[PDB]
């Protein structure tokens, strides 16, 4: 809409106040004009249209329940949108400043989230297994990434290119969430997944087999569920992002650390610069010594590392 940029206030899906930028045109609607081409939230209604209605308020306060999850889509696209073009130099999703969608109340009891090829959309959750999933950060982020994976390698979501796919989504929502400093952890979904359970997620990049998740080349799935075991798979690439990261030993092969930082500008030079719709994990591999080399230099420590994790979780 056309209007003038403002700033209201409200509470997310956890209950914590943030402000939000917005645009007065009548009402005022969040549309945030301050990021590249704008970011712009919308109203599902509990239906499965899309993308509803540009969200409109009359007072510019958004503290009602139905609020809650409108207030974080829009809130965490921009700190997305903010890691993106601060740490990667990436404007917005496309690198061009595209306008950023997102739609809340996606139907009724929706247990999940996802990129569609042109916008967000958040499920409220059914109460039980979720809450409104936009309340987590990493969960609005491994979204928006989708989006960048999806202008820039373009790894069909299928067998391994899906199973990357999804780990980049999950690398990429968890640095956000560390960039933000909101109580961050390499676990995917915690703070909207299983009210009045504490401590799960719907997956662990640290342990993924502490969800039924593979974290070794040797157990991976080889199904046809999960289109080939998208969310499945993905733990032996998540497994190898976090030991490149933090290090550690894993199946007696011993990784040095290299942090977030590293891991972060590895994998989007291999994302950005080398991954392909095909790519398998071998492929991810090269990638990534590929990128570390450019990087820091074939005889680096960084180099060393992503060999060591790639070998820990049988990829070579
Ligand atoms: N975005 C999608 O289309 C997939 C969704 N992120 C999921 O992991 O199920
Ligand atoms: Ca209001
Ligand atoms: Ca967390
Ligand atoms: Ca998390
Ligand atoms: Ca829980
Ligand atoms: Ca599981
Ligand atoms: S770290
Ligand atoms: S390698
Ligand atoms: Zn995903």
Redesign the pocket.
């Known amino acids: 809409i056309t209007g003038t940029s403002t700033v209201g206030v409200g509470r997310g899906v956890l209950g914590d106040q943030k402000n939000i930028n917005t645009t007065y045109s009548t009402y005022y609607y969040l549309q945030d004009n301050t990021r590249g081409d704008g970011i712009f939230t919308y109203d599902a209604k509990y239906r499965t249209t899309l993308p509803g209605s540009l969200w409109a308020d009359a007072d510019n306060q958004f503290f009602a329940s139905y609020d809650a999850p409108a207030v974080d889509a829009h809130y965490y696209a921009g700190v997305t949108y903010d890691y993106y073009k601060n740490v990667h130099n990436r404007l917005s999703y496309d690198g061009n400043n595209a306008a950023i969608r997102s739609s809340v109340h996606y139907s009724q009891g929706y247990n999940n989230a996802f990129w569609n090829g042109s916008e967000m959309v958040y499920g409220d959750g059914d109460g039980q297994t979720f809450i409104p999933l936009s309340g987590?950060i990493?969960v609005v982020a491994h979204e928006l990434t989708h989006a960048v994976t999806d202008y820039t390698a373009g790894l069909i979501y299928q067998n391994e290119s899906g199973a990357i796919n999804e780990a980049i989504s999950d690398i990429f929502?968890?640095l956000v969430?560390f960039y933000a400093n909101k109580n961050?952890?390499?676990?995917?979904?915690?703070?909207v997944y299983t009210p009045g359970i504490s401590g799960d997620?719907l997956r662990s990049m640290s342990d993924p087999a502490k969800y039924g998740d593979p974290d070794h080349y040797s157990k991976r799935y080889t199904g046809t569920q999960d289109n080939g075991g998208v969310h499945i798979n993905s733990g032996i690439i998540n497994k190898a992002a976090y030991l490149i990261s933090q290090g550690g030993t894993h199946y007696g092969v011993s990784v040095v650390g290299i942090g977030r930082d590293k891991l972060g500008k590895i994998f989007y030079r291999a994302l950005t610069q080398y991954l392909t719709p095909t790519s398998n994990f071998s492929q991810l591999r090269a990638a990534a010594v590929q990128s570390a080399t450019d990087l820091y230099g074939s005889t680096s420590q960084e180099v060393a590392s992503v060999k060591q994790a790639f070998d820990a979780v049988g990829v070579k």
């Open positions: 987590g990493d929502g968890t969430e961050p952890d390499w676990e995917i979904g915690e703070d997620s």
